[PDB]
């Protein structure tokens, strides 16, 4: 319960602050801010310790900000989201968007994309990318340029999977040292689905305006203040941009952004996709909210937004003057130097219900919120919503082991049913034709039970109640492979018995279940990360979708028996010949079970029909050219 649960955000924040990674990142950011006006990016350097220290590369996007300010703000013109699959260049983010269907594509900020393209124009960036290949890279940057760095980091990672075919990809970490929101919820979901959200961090000041100003609707977004904040890092259009600073009420602007953040921080609970009035910008990755007292790391995006709104809304005592955005965005070095010092001090305390409440209070004090203010009252509750309630994932896996052990006898009975009909027609055709119903009903019951169990396992995986390394365990992947290779033909027979292939579509394209695709991906990853001829037919067919191809080939042959158009029948005969060659190659290697070579199996009938069709003069003439 609450007494047995502990708060862990402040521990992670202290771990992040203690390490000099943030200090080195800010040093690189300051080096870039000091004269990165040249087209080339910030000096990689390496720190001298090539082995001890990973290569640290900073990215300053001041020139991109100047280019944007040349054309003016206009209102959302530079902040209009741009897609990746359709617009811009999808080559860089093909793994990111190679399947996009829901609420727009991943999308990205236009200015960040422009800065990324400008960096990509320089061949020196490509040379540096080639040099840092095969190592660990820390991607840093201040203001929007840091976000640009994130994009670059993403691109690097977006190519690492290409290089990391067998070995795991080298670790690359991006910090972005505080940047406005880059992508919508689609991009966050795409990153999370790739197990790629752990390579990004975000450090946001307590009273900074830039990281949270994107929460307002795009029509009211102050492009000028953000572009001028990026311009401020440049050493002393510029006069006009600075003039926009003076003609801006700090209190009024703070009121507007606070109101927008409050409106956007409670819309998640009342999920209304039908009314997306607010800006689609959403945070991604893990956010390290920093303050002179300390830090707190939040991974839940909803909790991240809630904590951001709570820490900006919570104002210091009125004796302190109105915080200027320049000082708020340009004091990060002082905080970097200060948080470890405060965390190394044993401050003496001067009726908590449980240790969880104490941890929440400590994290809130480290986050910089005002305890006396009422803003801490909802935030604590928000901190209670982020934490999940339940047993540890290790115990879940341990219980799932015995659950699978108990469920396996159903698979054993399915194996007995398959072995029963392996001599005359085959278990696939028997299941499709529903021969011997008193056994077909039992087989269907066992198949349904197995499918329900595996769907429950997948649902548990999707909720993150299981260990992250679940998909990289030999036992689970081989059990899933066995279940797939034994039961999937039954599912194909059930699908083709209801004539769903003529209404829903092809089984391999639309009718296939997500479970089987995930199992195939797991098997492929296991084979990559880790032959004598078969003297006898294998117990199970290696290809789980062979019967679907057989059914498609039979349908194509039946269509060709009546097709009259030469141009169409040419391509259908080409496909039939390709499948015939594939089937012959599979049979010669004896990679198929004996039930496939059964005299009354569908494969033999298809072979006979294909030979009869080939006997035709027109088919022979068409195949002769091919």
């Amino acid at each position: 319960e609450e007494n047995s649960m502990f708060e862990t955000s402040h521990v992670l924040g202290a771990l992040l602050a203690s390490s000099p990674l943030l200090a080195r990142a800010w040093d690189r950011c300051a080096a870039a801010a000091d004269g990165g006006a040249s087209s080339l990016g910030f000096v990689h350097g390496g720190g001298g310790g090539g082995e001890g220290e990973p290569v640290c590369v900073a990215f300053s996007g001041v020139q991109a900000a100047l280019s944007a300010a040349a054309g003016g703000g206009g209102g959302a013109e530079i902040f209009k989201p741009v897609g990746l699959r359709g617009d811009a260049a999808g080559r860089l983010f093909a793994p990111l968007v190679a399947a996009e269907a829901g609420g727009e594509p991943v999308a990205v900020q236009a200015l960040a994309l422009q800065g990324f393209l400008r960096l990509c124009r320089s061949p020196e960036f490509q040379v540096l990318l080639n040099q840092i290949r095969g190592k660990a890279v820390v991607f840093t940057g201040h203001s929007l340029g840091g976000a640009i760095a994130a994009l670059v980091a993403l691109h690097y990672l977006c190519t690492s999977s290409s290089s990391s075919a067998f070995a795991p990809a080298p670790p690359v970490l991006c910090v972005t040292f505080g940047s406005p929101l880059l992508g919508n919820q689609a991009l966050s979901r795409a990153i999370l689905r790739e197990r790629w959200a752990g390579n990004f961090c975000h450090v946001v000041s307590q009273h900074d305006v830039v990281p949270r100003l994107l929460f307002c609707p795009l029509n009211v977004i102050p492009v000028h203040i953000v572009v001028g904040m990026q311009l401020h890092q440049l050493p002393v259009v510029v006069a006009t941009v600075t003039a926009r600073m003076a003609d801006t009420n700090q209190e009024s602007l703070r009121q507007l952004i606070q109101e927008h953040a409050g409106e956007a921080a409670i819309e998640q609970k009342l999920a209304a996709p039908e009314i997306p009035s607010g800006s689609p910008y959403r945070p991604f990755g893990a956010y390290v909210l920093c303050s002179p007292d300390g830090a707190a790391c939040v991974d839940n995006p909803t909790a991240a937004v809630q904590m951001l709104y709570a820490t900006f809304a919570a104002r210091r005592a009125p004796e302190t003057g109105a915080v200027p955005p320049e000082a708020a965005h340009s004091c990060y070095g002082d905080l970097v130097l200060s948080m470890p010092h405060h965390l190394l001090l044993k401050r003496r305390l001067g009726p908590a219900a449980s240790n969880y409440d104490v941890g929440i209070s400590i994290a809130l004090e480290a986050s910089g919120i005002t305890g006396e203010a009422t803003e801490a009252a909802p935030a604590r509750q928000w901190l209670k919503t982020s934490k999940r309630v339940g047993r540890s994932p290790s115990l879940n896996c341990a219980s799932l082991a015995t659950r699978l052990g108990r469920i396996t006898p159903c698979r054993a009975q399915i194996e007995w049913y398959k072995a029963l009909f392996d001599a005359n027609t085959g278990y696939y055709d028997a299941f499709k034709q529903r021969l011997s119903p008193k056994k077909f009903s039992k087989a269907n019951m066992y198949r349904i039970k197995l499918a329900q169990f595996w769907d429950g396992v997948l649902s548990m995986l999707d909720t993150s109640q299981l260990p992250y390394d679940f998909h990289r365990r030999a036992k689970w992947v081989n059990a899933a492979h066995f279940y797939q290779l034994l039961v999937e033909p039954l599912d194909i027979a059930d699908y083709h018995r209801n004539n769903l292939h003529r209404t829903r579509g092809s089984y391999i394209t639309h009718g296939r279940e997500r479970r089987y695709e995930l199992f195939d991906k797991w098997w492929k990853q296991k084979g990559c990360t880790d032959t004598a001829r078969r003297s006898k037919f294998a117990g199970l067919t290696q290809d789980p979708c062979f019967w679907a191809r057989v059914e498609e080939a039979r349908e194509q042959t039946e269509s060709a028996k009546s097709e009259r158009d030469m141009t169409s029948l040419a391509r259908m005969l080409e496909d039939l010949h390709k499948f015939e060659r594939h089937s012959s190659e599979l049979v010669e290697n004896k990679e198929v079970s004996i039930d496939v070579v059964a005299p009354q199996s569908s494969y033999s009938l298809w072979v006979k029909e294909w030979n009869e069709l080939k006997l035709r003069e027109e088919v022979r003439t068409i195949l002769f050219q091919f």
Partner: protein, 424 residues
């Protein structure tokens, strides 16, 4: 030989038991050889013949089974010894030697005008001795026929004035009802078990009109012909058992008032119905129904909405129906219910919220209901539950109800795996 050395010993042992038990043994012998005999049909025919409506028939069956005379095959996943559920889950199998002794005892009587006529052979044609003695029709109460593909021309004139039951075992795609089926004026039960691997149809429907005082029927692997507009009131019919019968939506298109065609129907059993989208609503218009049992139907998506019109149902056994997902609310307004069985309902989302109105409920079976993980609050108001069989997952759910109801008992049962499905 063995007839006098060993078979005569068994005959003398049977001769020790007098009257009802001996005639029950003979009736069991008349049943088809090496065939699984359901308990319900045997009890029904015993009650019809020996007037053993009382549990004395059950006692006689137990006494017969206690002397290694008949094998009582009992399903492993059964927690009830001799309860109502167990009364429909047993089977009776006889030994070959005992059946041969019964055949010899029957043959001790005259060939014609005997008490039981049995032909223990698979000859396609009818017995030649019976045709030779066809001049004098027999008065045998039980007649056994075992022929293959038989047409209308493959019959000859018989009569059985005193017969009350007849067994017809065959294996073909079509069948014509013999003319002599229009001879018994007091026939009470008919058996139409079909061995044919292909679905078998029936002919001579007008013969069913001639049938009267019939109270039992057990069809198996028979395609039911559509019911025409003709009434044909089987008033005395009370029990119908359909096992592995493909209706082929014949009853779907039939719109006849079931209150007159089957006015006294009480027990209906549908087992292993391969193709059945939904039961017709007309079955809800029969108030005499008191026991509905749908078993191993994988296509039954939804029960009829107006299931509460029965107002007489006492035992509801709907199990092994994956397609079923919800129960009709009208089942809440079903008084006198005592045994509800929803076992093996894998895709049962939830129970109706008005379950509290189900008074006098005694036993609930919800084993292997993985999807069912929520119970209505009204279940706490069931002040009549005394025994619940369910898995361990629902035990936590019933932990709240067992405090309110003191006599409620929850039994945890685990799945059992066997290889009997192959035996058949």
């Amino acid at each position: 030989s063995h007839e006098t050395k060993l078979l005569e010993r068994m005959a003398a042992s049977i001769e020790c038991l007098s009257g009802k038990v001996r005639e029950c043994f003979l009736d069991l012998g008349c049943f088809p050889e090496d065939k699984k005999i359901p308990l319900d049909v045997l009890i029904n025919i015993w009650m019809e013949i020996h007037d053993l409506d009382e549990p004395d028939a059950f006692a006689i069956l137990v006494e017969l089974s206690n002397k290694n005379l008949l094998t009582l095959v009992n399903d492993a996943q059964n927690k009830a010894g001799d309860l109502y559920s167990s009364y429909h889950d047993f089977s009776v199998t006889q030994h070959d030697v005992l059946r041969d002794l019964a055949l010899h005892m029957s043959g001790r009587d005259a060939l014609n005008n005997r008490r039981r006529l049995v032909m223990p052979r698979r000859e396609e044609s009818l017995p030649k001795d019976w045709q030779r003695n066809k001049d004098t029709p027999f008065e045998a109460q039980i007649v056994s026929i075992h022929t293959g593909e038989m047409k209308e021309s493959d019959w000859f004139q018989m009569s059985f004035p005193k017969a009350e039951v007849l067994i017809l075992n065959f294996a073909s795609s079509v069948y014509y009802l013999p003319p002599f089926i229009a001879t018994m004026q007091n026939l009470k039960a008919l058996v139409l078990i079909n061995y044919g691997t292909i679905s078998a149809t029936l002919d001579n429907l007008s013969a069913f009109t001639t049938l009267s005082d019939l109270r039992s029927l057990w069809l198996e692997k028979i395609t039911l012909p559509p019911l025409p507009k003709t009434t044909i009131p089987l008033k005395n019919l009370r029990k119908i058992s359909l096992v592995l019968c493909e209706l082929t939506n014949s009853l779907r298109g039939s719109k006849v008032d079931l209150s007159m065609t089957f006015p006294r129907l009480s027990n209906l059993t549908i087992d292993h119905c391969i193709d059945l989208k939904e039961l017709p609503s007309s079955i809800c218009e029969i108030s005499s129904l008191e026991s509905i049992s749908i078993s191993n139907c994988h296509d039954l998506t939804e029960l009829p909405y107006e299931l509460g019109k029965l107002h007489c149902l006492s035992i509801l056994r709907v199990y092994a129906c994956p397609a079923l997902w919800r129960l009709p609310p009208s089942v809440c307004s079903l008084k006198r219910l005592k045994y509800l069985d929803i076992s093996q309902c894998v895709n049962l989302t939830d129970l109706p919220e008005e379950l509290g109105h189900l008074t006098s409920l005694e036993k609930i079976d919800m084993r292997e209901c993985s999807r069912l993980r929520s119970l209505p609050r009204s279940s706490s108001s069931l002040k009549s539950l005394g025994h619940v069989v369910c898995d361990e997952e629902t035990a936590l759910l019933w932990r709240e109800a067992e405090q309110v109801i003191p006599d409620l008992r929850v039994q945890v049962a685990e799945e059992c795996y066997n290889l009997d499905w192959l035996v058949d």
